[PDB]
Amino acid sequence: KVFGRCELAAAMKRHGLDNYRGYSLGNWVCAAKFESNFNTQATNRNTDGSTDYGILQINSRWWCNDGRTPGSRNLCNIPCSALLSSDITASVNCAKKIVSDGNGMNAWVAWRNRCKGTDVQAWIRGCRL
Ligand SMILES: C[N+](C)(CCO)Cc1cn(-c2cc(C(=O)O)nc(C(=O)O)c2)nn1
Ligand SMILES: C[N+](C)(CCO)Cc1cn(-c2cc(C(=O)O)nc(C(=O)O)c2)nn1
Ligand SMILES: C[N+](C)(CCO)Cc1cn(-c2cc(C(=O)O)nc(C(=O)O)c2)nn1
Ligand SMILES: [Cl-]
Ligand SMILES: [Cl-]
Ligand SMILES: [Cl-]
Numbered sequence: 001k002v003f004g005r006c007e008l009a010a011a012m013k014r015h016g017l018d019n020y021r022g023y024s025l026g027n028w029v030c031a032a033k034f035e036s037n038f039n040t041q042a043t044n045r046n047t048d049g050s051t052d053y054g055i056l057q058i059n060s061r062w063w064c065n066d067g068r069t070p071g072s073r074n075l076c077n078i079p080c081s082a083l084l085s086s087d088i089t090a091s092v093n094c095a096k097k098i099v100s101d102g103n104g105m106n107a108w109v110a111w112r113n114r115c116k117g118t119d120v121q122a123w124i125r126g127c128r129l
């Protein structure tokens with residue numbers, strides 16, 4: 001599923017991601033745009049042979065099982081494919097664990113480089129939330 005901007009903002013808010021660990025909703029929307037272009041089916045292979053999955057490009061090295069990242073963890077206790085669903089529940093619940101692990105949203109490279117320190121509220125401008 002490719003979400004619209006406000007559609008994704010509303011889904012993220014409903015799932016409690018707005019202000020989670022102090023990160024306003026615009027931070028999450030900005031991160032998703034640059035990680036996945038709002039596409040739940042996005043996948044990308046990393047140099048170490050792990051893969052990033054879904055709207056927030058969650059890494060099989062640590063967070064989900066894909067059966068082909070030997071030596072990795074599955075800290076969200078989910079198959080990576082669950083992170084590709086049109087329903088973002090699994091991605092949100094896993095993202096909550098990720099952002100809580102000590103490094104906040106810096107775990108998302110695209111967030112650090114493209115969203116951090118910018119006017120992130122612009123990402124939800126005009127939405128009825
Ligand atoms: C109309 N649908 C497809 C379904 C019903 O909400 C939602 C939707 C809205 N989309 C959208 C697409 C785009 C765009 O492609 O730039 N932009 C926005 C926006 O708010 O800036 C929103 N993409 N999908
Ligand atoms: C009119 N320009 C801006 C320039 C050339 O005609 C092109 C253009 C861009 N459009 C557009 C429209 C929308 C939108 O309506 O959501 N979103 C985007 C986007 O990048 O998110 C871009 N619609 N037309
Ligand atoms: C204004 N910047 C800084 C632009 C950065 O790329 C952030 C931004 C982008 N926004 C935006 C604006 C629009 C729009 O107005 O159509 N659409 C989208 C979209 O994803 O479809 C995204 N809203 N805020
Ligand atoms: Cl914030
Ligand atoms: Cl915001
Ligand atoms: Cl594996």
Ligand SMILES: [Cl-]
Nearest residue numbers: 066067068069
């Ligand atoms: Cl393979």
Ligand SMILES: [Cl-]
Nearest residue numbers: 065077078079
């Ligand atoms: Cl699993």
Ligand SMILES: [Cl-]
Nearest residue numbers: 011086087088
């Ligand atoms: Cl959803």
Ligand SMILES: [Cl-]
Nearest residue numbers: 021103104105
């Ligand atoms: Cl933090």
Ligand SMILES: [Cl-]
Nearest residue numbers: 115116117118
């Ligand atoms: Cl920020």
Ligand SMILES: [Eu+3]
Nearest residue numbers: 003004005006
């Ligand atoms: Eu648009």
Ligand code: NA
Nearest residue numbers: 049050051068
């Ligand atoms: Na992999």
Ligand code: NA
Nearest residue numbers: 060064072073
């Ligand atoms: Na794994």
